[PDB]
Write an enzyme that holds these catalytic residues in place. Structure first.
Site, short mmCIF file in Angstrom:
data_model
loop_
_atom_site.label_atom_id
_atom_site.label_comp_id
_atom_site.label_asym_id
_atom_site.label_seq_id
_atom_site.Cartn_x
_atom_site.Cartn_y
_atom_site.Cartn_z
N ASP A 174 -56.09 71.77 -36.72
CA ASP A 174 -55.46 71.41 -36.26
C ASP A 174 -54.77 70.08 -36.16
O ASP A 174 -54.31 69.20 -35.42
CB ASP A 174 -56.87 70.43 -34.73
N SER A 175 -54.90 69.95 -37.42
CA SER A 175 -53.18 69.33 -37.70
C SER A 175 -51.93 69.77 -37.79
O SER A 175 -51.34 70.85 -37.85
CB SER A 175 -53.22 68.38 -39.19
#
Ligand SMILES: [Zn+2]
Ligand SMILES: [Zn+2]
Ligand SMILES: [Zn+2]
Ligand SMILES: [Zn+2]
Ligand SMILES: [Zn+2]
Lengths: 48, 252, 98, 134, 44, 64, 48, 48, 49, 98
Positions: free
Chosen positions: D9-10
């Site tokens: 999720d970066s």
């Protein structure tokens, strides 16, 4: 280490000032701890 | 008490809450400062009677929408009087009413005795008696009331325009300066100036309306007005808009 | 095309305008550190001074973890040396602090 | 999957877009303070503490404060700075100035002074801090 | 010590003793005038 | 609040095309035709003007 | 202006102000662990 | 730069540690305090 | 769903009951004392406000 | 009501700025009848007796921002898009959750 007669309070221990310190609030007013407040009543009634 | 540098002004440090030697760096005391405390970044009759007095002050103040600062000042004034005990014989309601009058005077927003009487069960007379007694008890004094101290409240209560309030203020101030109303109560003078300005303006108010709101008899207003009416053109401001010219103001 | 070498990427990338929102959670609002900071005079334990320097609570779950690790020395440091290192004199004859 | 810095999720952002103002924002933090005369022995008031006025004062600079004890708009502030100089009369007068947090670093955007619901002197200081995506 | 009335935007000088009330508008919201000191912004 | 000076994605000057763009819309140009007339070929530059909301126009309704 | 002996804030119980030391310990606020006072009861009391 | 580790001064590191002391808090890496053999703490930022 | 209306109505009903209860006590005290009471003073505006 | 006691219409912006409570003065007509066991009754009516202040929900029919055009709202420093429906209590916008 334990005796029945020691269950009766004949002398009351007073906690050190560090255990019940006097906080300062609204300036230089030394706000005493709750213990100091009750200790004041204790000594007053004791003298009385 | 720096161990190495006697008589050294230790510096307080918020980073750890400790005091450091001003010329050595030696930390005196581990973390004794308590930085949070330094930088912000079943009832006694006396207390019950005091509490009851506070409940009365807040009630009377609310009736006239007095700000909380005046209430706080009144409570502190009451406490001093109550603790000084020179009025121990007087009723707490009378003391509270007079303290409230004094607080308004000290705050620079004087309320007439009739106004304080209108919100309290204590009569003007008893409040007036308690008033001077408290001043002696407190060894204090209050600034003399002036005609301009009531113009804002009265003109607003009369719904008079800002210019009418300003004109009334100038008329009253100049009337006092000209000494046209010797010995007349400032309230009587203020009401007369308001009547004059109102009668000179589009928003015309009767002496009864002004008297009822200002707390002055129409006769007292009429007499005070009669004294200032001859000099009205001198009392009115130069930069004033006349809806009714000063020369046409009511004569009576 | 790869920005570093300019070589085409073997796979073709799905790219396009998409509406993104920035959330109120900024790192500068959450970063905090504590190292020998202000302690409570009554409790003699860490507390916030003029910042978020109050330290992290080394709770029961962390203690149990360190116990499982068997790091008794580190466990002692976090629960004693890093919070309220104190020493008192106690009588050997009466066992009371003197 | 550009070099793995967006894993779990970066997100990877274009520094040049951020330099152009992409997602740039302004954070406004408002500080409120009032002076209350509750208790005749104590009277807090806004005014810059002075060596002769206060028995004890830190080496921290109060130069940011004006003669009214309030910082003016357009002045840079940080955790080392004082936004409000308040002093309370002792039963000498003690200082109870309002310092910002070490994380608080910005410029004073607006400073208003009024009379609050209580009728006490009241002031609100809005500090503007610009938050660049990072 | 100049304050700007929030309603009439009039610069007025106010002392510590006199009230915050606007001289002419009577409005009680005053905004401190922007500091005359120099603030440098890098245009980044 | 106001039109970006540079297109975020590529850096093209778009801060001088807003009033031009508004003029084209007032001239009944479609949003696509107006963007084409302005020469905004890349969709990243088109995204700037097509999606911009000029709130400064609304903020200027409040007295200074 | 100073604490009184035999009072609630007796200086023997501990340090009174951070910039001070108690006579019994001769140590600072952190050095002093604090000490107990005692109240002899004129009449014994049951311990709750 | 905010957190510190207390390194004991040894002949292995006397020179390296002396450098960090003069660098202080303004320059990273540096040091916050010096603890002498006496156990007293000296803040390097106060008097470098 | 109790919106702002039903919620405030529930409060105002209780505060008004307290106001009338307060007026009775004040008025009854004056009546007991044998004197008429000023209705303007019996009302305590703090209750509702 | 100002310190001097001058009543003035409170704008919501002022309430938020000065931490005021946006309240409306509440008045009630009261009729007092007295009977003195002499088959006679005296009826007195206190017109518009003040009983307190009711906090006003913004943009409600009793709010000053009621019926104001968008330009008038802007003149009052109020956002035309602001939905209202909340109360200003001591300057804090309080919303009642259903
Ligand atoms: Zn020394
Ligand atoms: Zn022993
Ligand atoms: Zn003004
Ligand atoms: Zn582009
Ligand atoms: Zn000791």
């Amino acid at each position: 280490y334990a005796r029945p007669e020691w269950m009766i309070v004949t002398v009351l221990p007073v906690p050190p000032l560090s255990v019940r310190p006097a906080v300062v609030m609204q300036g230089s007013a030394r706000n005493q701890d709750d213990l100091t407040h009750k200790l004041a009543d204790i000594v007053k009634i004791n003298n009385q | 008490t720096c161990p190495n540098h006697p008589d050294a002004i230790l510096v307080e440090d918020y980073r750890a809450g400790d005091m450091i030697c001003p010329e050595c760096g030696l930390v005196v005391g581990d973390r004794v400062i308590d930085v949070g405390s330094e930088w912000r970044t079943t009832m006694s009759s006396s207390d019950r009677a005091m509490m009851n007095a506070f409940k009365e002050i807040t009630t009377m103040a609310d009736r006239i929408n007095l700000p909380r600062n005046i209430v706080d000042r009144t409570n502190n004034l009451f406490k001093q009087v109550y603790e000084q005990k020179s009025l121990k014989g007087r009723a707490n309601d009378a003391i509270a009413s007079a303290c409230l009058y004094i607080a308004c005077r000290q705050e620079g927003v004087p309320r007439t005795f009739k106004e304080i009487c209108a919100v309290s069960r204590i009569s003007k007379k008893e409040i007036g008696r308690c008033f001077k007694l408290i001043l002696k008890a407190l060894e204090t004094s209050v600034d003399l009331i002036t005609t301009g101290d009531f113009m804002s409240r009265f003109c607003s209560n009369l719904c008079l325009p800002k210019q009418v309030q300003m004109a009334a203020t100038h008329i009253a101030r100049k009337a006092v300066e000209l000494d046209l109303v010797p010995g007349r109560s400032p309230i009587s003078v203020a009401a007369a100036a308001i009547y004059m300005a109102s009668q000179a303006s589009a928003e015309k108010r009767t002496q009864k309306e002004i008297g009822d709101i200002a707390g002055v008899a129409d006769v007292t207003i009429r007499q005070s007005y009669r004294l200032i009416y001859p000099r009205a053109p001198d009392l009115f401001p130069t930069d004033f808009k006349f809806d009714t010219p000063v020369d046409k103001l009511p004569q009576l | 095309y790869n920005g570093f070498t300019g070589r085409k990427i073997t796979s073709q990338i799905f790219i396009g305008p998409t509406y993104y929102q920035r959330l109120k959670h900024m790192v500068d609002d959450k970063i905090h550190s504590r190292a020998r900071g202000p302690i409570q005079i009554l409790n003699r334990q860490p507390m916030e001074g003029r910042s978020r320097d109050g330290g992290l609570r080394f709770g029961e779950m962390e203690r149990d973890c360190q116990i499982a690790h068997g790091a008794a020395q580190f466990l002692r440091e976090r629960l004693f040396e890093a919070s309220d290192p104190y020493q008192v004199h106690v009588c050997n004859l009466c066992g009371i602090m003197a | 999957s550009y070099t793995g810095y967006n894993q779990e999720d970066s997100v990877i952002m274009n520094r040049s877009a951020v330099d152009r103002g992409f997602f740039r924002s302004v954070f406004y933090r408002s500080y409120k303070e009032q002076e209350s005369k509750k208790g005749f022995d104590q009277e807090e008031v806004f005014e810059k503490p002075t060596r002769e006025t206060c028995q004890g004062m830190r080496h921290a600079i109060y130069d940011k404060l004006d003669d009214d004890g309030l910082i003016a708009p357009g002045v840079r502030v940080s955790g080392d700075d004082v936004i409000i100089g308040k002093t309370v009369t002792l039963p000498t007068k003690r200082d109870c100035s309002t310092f910002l947090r070490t994380s608080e670093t910005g410029i004073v955007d607006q400073v208003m002074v009024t009379l609050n619901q209580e009728g006490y002197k009241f002031c609100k200081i809005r500090v503007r801090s610009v938050r660049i995506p990072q | 010590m100049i304050y700007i009335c929030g309603e009439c935007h009039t610069e007025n000088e106010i002392k510590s003793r006199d009230p915050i009330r606007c001289r002419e508008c009577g409005y009680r919201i005053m905004y401190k005038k922007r500091t005359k000191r120099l603030v440098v912004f890098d245009a980044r | 609040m106001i039109i970006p000076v540079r297109c975020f994605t590529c850096g093209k000057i778009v801060g001088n095309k807003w009033e031009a763009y508004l003029g084209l819309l007032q001239a009944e140009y479609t949003e696509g035709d107006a963007l084409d007339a302005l020469g905004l070929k890349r969709y990243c530059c088109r995204r700037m003007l097509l999606a911009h909301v000029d709130l400064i126009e609304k903020l200027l309704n409040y007295a200074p | 202006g100073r604490p009184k002996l035999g009072g609630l804030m007796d200086p023997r119980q501990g340090v009174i102000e951070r910039t001070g030391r108690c006579q019994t310990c001769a140590g600072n606020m952190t050095e002093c662990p604090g000490h107990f006072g005692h109240i002899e009861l004129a009449k014994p009391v049951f311990h709750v | 730069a905010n957190m510190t580790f207390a390194e004991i001064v040894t002949p292995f590191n006397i020179d390296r540690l002396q450098e960090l002391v003069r660098r202080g808090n303004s320059q990273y890496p540096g040091a916050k305090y010096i603890i002498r053999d006496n156990g007293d703490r000296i803040d390097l930022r106060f008097h470098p | 769903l109790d919106l702002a209306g039903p919620l405030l109505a529930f409060l105002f009903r209780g505060m008004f009951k307290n106001l009338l209860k307060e007026v009775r006590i004040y008025a009854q005290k004056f009546i007991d004392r044998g004197k008429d009471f000023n209705l303007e003073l019996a009302i305590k505006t703090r209750i509702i406000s | 009501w100002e310190r001097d006691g001058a009543p003035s219409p409170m704008m919501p912006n002022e309430a938020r700025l000065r931490n005021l409570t946006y309240s409306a003065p509440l008045y009630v007509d009261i009729t007092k009848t007295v009977i003195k066991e002499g088959e006679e009754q005296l009826q007195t009516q206190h017109q518009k007796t003040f009983i307190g202040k009711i906090p006003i929900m913004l943009r409600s029919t009793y709010c000053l921002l009621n019926g104001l055009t968008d330009r008038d709202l802007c003149e009052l420093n109020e956002c035309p898009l602001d939905p209202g429906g909340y109360f200003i209590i001591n300057g804090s916008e309080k919303v009642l959750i259903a």
